[PDB]
């Protein structure tokens, strides 16, 4: 199902990492490495399938691991109101 980064989130990249600020909850977060890469792909409007394929192309990792980890990561983003439209 269609999803996107919350319109309330500001992203601040700092070499390798991203700091996220949620303007309505007033909470901030950090991402690094693969999390930061996933965030960048979400910023581009990439769908979960596309994100899985990108991580599989860019990292020494098997598809099942990427799928399992991505699901949990997207759920964590959704739980903190950083990502909208998420469904399993």
């Amino acid at each position: 199902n269609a999803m996107k980064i919350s319109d309330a989130v500001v992203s601040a990249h700092i070499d390798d990492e991203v700091v996220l600020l949620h303007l309505q909850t007033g909470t901030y977060f950090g991402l690094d490495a693969v999390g930061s890469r996933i965030w960048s792909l979400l910023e581009e409007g990439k769908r979960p399938e596309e994100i899985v394929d990108a991580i599989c192309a860019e990292y020494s990792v098997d598809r099942p691991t990427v799928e399992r980890d991505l699901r949990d990561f997207l759920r964590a983003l959704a739980n903190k109101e950083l990502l909208e439209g998420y469904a399993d």
């Binding site: 007033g26 977060f29 991402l31 693969v34 999390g35 990292y59 990561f73």
Partner: peptide, 17 residues
């Protein structure tokens, strides 16, 4: 190609505004 580690969301808490 890069070494993989599981993506994690780090929470820092309340920002200074």
């Amino acid at each position: 190609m890069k070494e993989y580690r599981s993506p994690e969301l780090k929470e820092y808490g309340r920002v200074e505004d």
